[PDB]
Amino acid sequence: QTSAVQQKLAALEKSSGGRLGVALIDTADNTQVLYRGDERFPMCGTSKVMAAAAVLKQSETQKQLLNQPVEIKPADLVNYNPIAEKHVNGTMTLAELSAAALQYSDNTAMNKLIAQLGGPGGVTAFARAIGDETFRLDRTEPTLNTAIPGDPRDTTTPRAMAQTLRQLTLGHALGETQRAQLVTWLKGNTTGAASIRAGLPTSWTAGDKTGSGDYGTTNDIAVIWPQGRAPLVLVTYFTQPQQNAESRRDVLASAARIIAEGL
Template structure:
C-alpha cells in the first residue's frame, strides 16, 4: 500500500526543492524525474537528498544535492578505501577488549575471545556488516576523525567531515554540521574512489567486491534497480527518537556497461523503517527508468 501510494504521489506531484541539471543534457528531460523525487519526498514526510553520478558524464541529477545530511555509517566506505591505501595497515593486528565492543558489532563479537582482527578484516566487515567496533579500530589506527577528514580533502572532497567516532557520530541533531556530507559530494567521492587512480586497480576491485557482498541494503536503493543491473551499496542508519535518517550509496552497472553512483539520504521521515526503505527503493526505480529512457 505504501509503495503504491508513493508511486501515485510521485507521478502527480512537482515540488520546489532545488534540482541540478545534468552536465550533458540527456534526450529526455529531467522534469519528470524531478517531479517523482519531489513526490516521494513529500509522501515520506521527511527531507530527501539524492545525487546521480556517472563515470562518463559526472553529475547527472541531484535533488537537495548541496544540502548537508548526517552520514551515519556511509562513511565506512571511504574509511575502507583509506585503509586499503595506507601502507601496511591491512596486515596489522588490531587488538581490542570487551570495553571496545559496541552494541552493533557482529564481527567483533565473533572475535571477542580472540581479541583482535587484522586491518583488512576490519575494513571488510566495516563495509559488509557495518561493524561499529571494526570502524572505531580503523579510525584509531589511522589517526581519528580529523585524519580521516584530512584524507577526504586530499582525495578531492571539500565538503564531507567526520568529527566523532561510533556511536556518537549517529546523533543527527538538527542543524549540527558535524559528521555530515552532501549527496553530490558523496556520490562524486565514491565515483572517484572506484573509477579514478587514487586506489590501485587491485584495491578498487576489492572495495567494489565488498560493496557487492554487502546485504544490508537489499530493500533500499538496490531494491529498486532492475534485475540484471550489477549493484553494490553501503547503507547508513542513525538518529535518535524523532530524528531518524536512512541512507544508502549504491554503485551499479547497466547491461550496456555504463557505471553510476547513486547517493540517497532520507532525513526524518514520518513512517516506519520499512516505509523509509521503500522510499529509497522507489527513488532508485525512478532513476533507473530515467537512465533507460534518456540514454544517459
C-alpha cells in the first residue's frame, strides 16, 4: 500500500530529480514508515556512527581504551581534517578521534577508528554482531564516498540503518555507559542544522550524523525527542544522477518535515 506520507515523499523526490530513501521508527508504538526502505544508498559520513559505536563496544572490556593515544602523522591527513590537522606529529586518544569523527565529521579521525577495528571489514563485523545484516563498509576515507550509482560498496538501506541506530542509541546494542556516550556525542553534532533538524519543530531535540559524497549524495541519520512523546529514529538518504551534482540538504529537511507533519 501507499500512504499519504509516502505519496508526499514521492512528490518531493520527483521534484528533486534524485533518489530519496527514508526510514522512520516511532518508538511510541514501534511503527515504521519507509520510502525506498530496502534500496541501497551510499552511506558516506553516516557510516562514522557504526565505527564509533564499534570502538565503544571494544571499550566495554577495556576501561582505558578511549584514553589510548593514536599517532597522527602528516601522511595520515586526507580531504577533510579540521581536528586532526591540529594534532599532526602528535596524538589523539580514541575518545578524541570518536568525538572528532562524529561531531566534526573529521575523515582522518574516521580512518583511525577503522584502523583500530582492523579495517573496513571490522566495522562490518560489528554491524553483523548487533544484528545488522545489510550494512557494509569496504573502503577507508576518502574513497568510501565515491557514491557511484549501482556500486554496493559502502552502502546500506534506510530500513537497516534506522533499526541499527535505534538499537545503538535507545536499545541495548551497547552498555549503558557507552550508549549514553554515543548519544552525548550525537547531540553535540555541529553539522546538522540544515538537514533533518531543519524540518523539525524547534521545540524538538535531536542528535544526528550527516554525510555527503560524490553524485550530490546528501545524508542524515537522527535520533529525535519530539515534544510530548516517545523518541523517533529517522534516516534520510539522497543521491543524484550526475557525479558533480550539488548537495541538497534542503531535500532532507523537506523529507523530515513531511514525516513530522505525518505524525
